[PDB]
Design a protein around this ligand. Sequence first.
Ligand code: NAG
Ligand code: NAG
Lengths: 48, 50
Amino acid sequence: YFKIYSKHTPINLVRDLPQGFSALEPLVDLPIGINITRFQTLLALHRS
Amino acid sequence: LTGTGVLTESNKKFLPFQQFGRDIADTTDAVRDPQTLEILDITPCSFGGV
Ligand SMILES: *[C@@H]1O[C@H](CO)[C@@H](O)[C@H](O)[C@H]1NC(C)=O
Ligand SMILES: *[C@@H]1O[C@H](CO)[C@@H](O)[C@H](O)[C@H]1NC(C)=O
């Protein structure tokens, strides 16, 4: 089971992480049953 | 989940993910019923010493 816990917070700090407390609610309990050892995030380009 | 008790209305604001509730003993004290998704409080039936 691949658990995704998520939280959205309105922040106004410019550069670093804000200092505070925010508990992440469980979002998706996912039934995959596969081996995971390495990951990579996906970004989006801007074209002009 | 098996047990004995009186099922009553409750005022506990359960979060969407949350289904049941547990006391200190870890016995279920509130439950979310399937099909109707409502939150029923479980209060143990009255007992005492005769
Ligand atoms: C997952 O894969 C790694 C190597 O890619 C292996 O060492 C590990 O034992 C695997 N785990 C499971 C649960 O299959
Ligand atoms: C059946 O249960 C699902 C969730 O368990 C619920 O969304 C649905 O409304 C229920 N249907 C009826 C007819 O009770």
